[PDB]
Amino acid sequence: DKLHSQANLMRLKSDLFNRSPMYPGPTKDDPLTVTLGFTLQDIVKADSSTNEVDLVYYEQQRWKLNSLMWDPNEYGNITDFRTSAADIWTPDITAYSSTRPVQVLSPQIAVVTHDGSVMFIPAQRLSFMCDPTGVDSEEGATCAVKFGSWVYSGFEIDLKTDTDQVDLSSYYASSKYEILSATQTRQVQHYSCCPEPYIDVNLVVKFRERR
Amino acid sequence: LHSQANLMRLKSDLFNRMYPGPTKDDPLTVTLGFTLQDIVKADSSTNEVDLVYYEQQRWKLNSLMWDPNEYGNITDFRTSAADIWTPDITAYSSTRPVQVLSPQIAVVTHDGSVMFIPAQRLSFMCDPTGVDSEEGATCAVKFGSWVYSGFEIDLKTDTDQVDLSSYYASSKYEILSATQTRQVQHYSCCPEPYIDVNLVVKFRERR
């Protein structure tokens, strides 16, 4: 019940990864929902000489593939497993107004459940375009950054948010900056050429210098 | 040549002939210990502090055991950390990717136990206010697995005293105290324990 449980897991992973050709990503015929949520940890830097602000956050990404489902009965009652993010397809969710390459702070490991659901949570430091003017006033400064796919329309990857309220429960209590509000909002756009929606998640942070 | 031929065989056996990580059915204990070498920088303009330390990590896998009489009384060996599984222990309030300062090599003994000691520079979230006073500053940083609960990886320390026996005598900051303490929580949804090791350093500018 130990090397067998270990054997069962090894067999499951082999069956999902090895006995199967590569998931080529989503399509119009086979679209995918990706749900995003931010846990904002800190505003580390605000640079008014260049209008760049630096954030640290955990980005929760959730999606579900038919090709990742299994019957726990076939595999010793295994209901979930952890695996390297490189063993699986992951979405191309990008900040659209970064000014430096995003830096990864955490191990690149996902959790997969038997219904095919994947949860992947990269912790990141991001530099993005932001004018911090007013950060030393009562009303503060307001910055915004859009996240979205680099190559997929809303008919291929639909994006949603885990509520429109950014999670501030882990925000560093002794940051140089206090959060006045933080929101994460699904936005939709259509172009005259084309039927598909183009969907972004707008992260909007209002903040001021902490007394 | 005796050792050489047996060790070559041992490594090929153990490695070439994959450990899927721990589970609730096959859980693992990881023991953590910090040897704090230096507080290099304290930035009060961004509330970031930079530490240099050796992080001792210990664990034991059955799949790494061997009989020494099958391999010429070889009882231990060193190998690239890349040849084996290693735990996903992470500082939870880092502000920059951790920088590695040492070879990534582990020591494996015949009972399957592994010791891995990465030397690291870490930038983390810390307000150093009071560092230029008698009472000094206090900062804290939590370590734990990124994906495993306490039912999969049981995280512990053997002592709550940080190892200060190698701390840089001429650092800009002297250490007033440093502790490494297991903390366990539960969430109301769930029976599993979630276990952190909290590193708490109290320091001040050297006099």
Binding site: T39, Y58, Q60, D80, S106, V111, T113, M119, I121, A123, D167, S169, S170 | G144, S145, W146, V147, Y148, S149, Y187, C189, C190, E192, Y194
Partner: peptide, 12 residues
């Protein structure tokens, strides 16, 4: 909470 904790949030 569970839902902010990267070890737990997969259950939410």
């Amino acid at each position: 909470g569970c839902c902010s904790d990267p070890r737990c949030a997969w259950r939410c």
